[PDB]
Amino acid sequence: GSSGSSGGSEEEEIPFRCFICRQAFQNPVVTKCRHYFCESCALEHFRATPRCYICDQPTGGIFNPAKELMAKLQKSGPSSG
Applying CB under 5 A, which residues contact Zn ion? 18, 20-21, 33, 35, 38, 41, 52, 54-55
CB-nearer residue toward Zn ion: 43 or 55: 55
What is the rounded CA–CA span in Å between residue 25 and residue 17?
5
CB-nearer residue toward Zn ion: 58 or 71: 58
- Report whether 70 contacts 28 (CB < 8 A): yes
- Report whether 15 contacts 38 (CB < 8 A): no
Determine which helix (DSSP H) or strand (DSSP E) holds 64, and give its type and residue range. strand 64-65
CB-nearer residue toward Zn ion: 2 or 27: 27
CB of 7 to Zn ion, least distance (A): 27
CB of 34 to Zn ion, least distance (A): 7
